[PDB]
C-alpha cells in the first residue's frame, strides 16, 4: 500500500497499460490494477499503480496531482450537507478551507472512500454551523466551478 499509488479521476480513454505508460516517466511502475464494476463491467475511475520503490510513488503523487488526463481530474495519492461529483485531488483540510469562505465549519469534514481502494468514492458529507451557511452553500457552492469537476451540494435530510 505504501509503494502503490491510488489514482482517481480516470475517464473512458484511460486504460490499464495507459496509466502504466504515463507513470513510467515518474518511476518504475511494476503493475497496474483497475477494478471493474458489476453492472457496467468497466472501470469506475479509480485505479492503482504498484511501483517498485516508495520514492517513485511519492514522486508520482507529487507530480501527477490534479492533472487533466483524458478530460478528467486525475490525481495520485498514497494508498447536514452532501457534496457529489467532487475531485479526488482535494483533501479534508482543502475541503475545510474551501468551505470556510462561505460559512463557518463545525468540525473537520469527512469524505467517503471505497472499501477496496480507499482513496475516494465520489461523495462527501460536511456539516455547517447554522442553516445560513447551508443555504449559502446550496445557493453558491451548489454549482460552482471546482478543479475540473462540477460539484453538486444538496441537503442530506429535510423535513416538509
Amino acid at each position: 500500500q505504501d509503494a502503490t499509488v491510488y489514482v482517481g479521476g480516470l475517464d473512458e480513454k484511460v486504460s490499464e497499460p495507459l496509466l502504466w505508460e504515463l507513470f513510467l516517466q515518474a518511476g518504475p511502475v511494476v503493475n497496474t490494477h483497475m477494478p471493474k464494476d458489476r453492472v457496467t463491467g468497466q472501470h469506475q475511475g479509480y485505479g492503482f499503480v504498484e511501483f517498485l520503490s516508495e520514492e517513485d510513488a511519492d514522486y508520482a503523487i507529487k507530480i501527477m496531482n490534479m492533472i487533466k488526463l483524458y478530460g478528467k481530474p486525475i490525481r495520485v495519492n498514497k494508498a447536514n450537507i452532501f457534496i457529489g461529483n467532487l475531485d479526488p485531488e482535494i483533501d479534508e483540510k482543502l475541503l475545510y478551507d474551501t468551505f470556510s469562505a462561505f460559512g463557518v465549519i463545525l468540525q473537520t469534514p469527512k469524505i467517503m472512500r471505497d472499501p477496496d481502494t480507499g482513496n475516494s468514492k465520489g461523495y462527501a458529507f460536511i456539516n455547517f454551523a447554522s442553516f445560513d451557511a447551508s443555504d449559502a452553500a446550496i445557493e453558491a457552492m451548489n454549482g460552482q466551478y471546482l478543479c475540473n469537476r462540477p460539484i453538486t451540494v444538496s441537503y442530506a435530510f429535510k423535513k416538509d
Partner: protein
C-alpha cells in the same frame, strides 16, 4: 407550513434607496415588533406568475413578515455578495435595513 399560512400579507409600499459605492442599498421599513429580521435572497427570473419572455437575469429580493418583498434586478454576474450574515445589517432601534 404553520408559519407560512399564518403570515399576514397586506403588501405595503416599501422605500428602497440604492447608491453605487466603491471600496449598498437602504430599505426603510416600519416597526415590525418582532425578532425576525428581514432576509435577502438572490433568485432567477425563470419562475414568475406570468413567465415573460427574454427573462435571463437575476434579482435580489428582501422580504419581511409584515411587509412585502422588494426586488432589484442585477444585470451583472457577480459584483457583491447576497449573504445574510456576511454583508447585511438591520438596526432595530431605527428600523433601518442595509445590504452591501
Amino acid at each position: 407550513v404553520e408559519v407560512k399560512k399564518f403570515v399576514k400579507i397586506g403588501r405595503p409600499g416599501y422605500k428602497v434607496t440604492k447608491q453605487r459605492d466603491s471600496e449598498l442599498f437602504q430599505i426603510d421599513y416600519p416597526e415590525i415588533a418582532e425578532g425576525i429580521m428581514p432576509r435577502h435572497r438572490f433568485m432567477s427570473a425563470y419562475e414568475q406568475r406570468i413567465e415573460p419572455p427574454d427573462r435571463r437575469w437575476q434579482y435580489l429580493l428582501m422580504a419581511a413578515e409584515p411587509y412585502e418583498t422588494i426586488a432589484f434586478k442585477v444585470p451583472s454576474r457577480e459584483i457583491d455578495k447576497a449573504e445574510g450574515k456576511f454583508w447585511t445589517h438591520w438596526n432595530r432601534e431605527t428600523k433601518q435595513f442595509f445590504l452591501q
